[PDB]
Design a protein around this ligand. Structure first.
Ligand SMILES: CCOP(=O)(COc1ccc(C[C@H](NC(=O)O[C@H]2CO[C@H]3OCC[C@H]32)[C@H](O)CN(CC(C)C)S(=O)(=O)c2ccc3ncsc3c2)cc1)OCC
Lengths: 99, 99
């Protein structure tokens, strides 16, 4: 669909079998979700944002559905203020910006 | 234009008489720019993201040209790691997300 930006671009995602709300974020290289239990192995990682660096759990090759579009890729889990879908998954669902 | 997300969506902008590179960021409510000495009045503000908050100066009714499309609105100036064009200005150039 065509999503305008007068409101935050929030969508429903399905991950690890559960529904969550997340922000489509073209300024995020990577997808970062709030603390959650995810099955699978993970490794410690660091990511930086506007205010500094945080510690996250990096889960590779995770299935995630974004408005009924399937993606499989890296998901970082940590103390982000909001669930954000980054370019690593936006590219998989074919998202582009247009003006 | 159409902007794919394989790479960070960086574009040229014109602000306060100067040219800069900035990120088109649907996850940003507001527009945040690297330190610059813009004329006029401003108000202090704190904006938060991953890693915490930064202190910024809020300037009102600032004109920015984004790839030829003009916008007028609030601009926040502070020690951000990158120039970020947020939804408050993206809406004005009619930028949408499409997948
Ligand atoms: C030189 C680089 O240095 P650097 O690496 C960090 O650079 C950066 C810093 C910030 C951004 C933009 C943000 N991206 C992000 O955090 O993405 C992370 C996940 O994927 C990775 O890729 C890029 C970073 C990693 C988001 O799009 C927008 N944010 C909000 C969301 C909800 C969190 S916002 O900026 O916090 C923001 C903007 C306006 C606003 N108005 C009111 S609130 C408010 C909050 C891109 C790059 O670390 C230095 C220590």
């Amino acid at each position: 669909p065509q999503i305008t930006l007068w409101k935050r671009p929030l969508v429903t995602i399905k991950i690890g079998g559960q529904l969550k709300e997340a922000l489509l974020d073209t300024g995020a290289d990577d997808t970062v979700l709030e603390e959650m239990n995810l099955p699978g192995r993970w490794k410690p990682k660091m990511i930086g944002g506007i205010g500094g660096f945080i510690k996250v759990r990096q889960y590779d090759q995770i299935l995630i559905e974004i408005c009924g579009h399937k993606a499989i890729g890296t998901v970082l889990v940590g103390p982000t203020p909001v669930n954000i879908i980054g370019r690593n998954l936006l590219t998989q669902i074919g998202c582009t910006l247009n003006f």
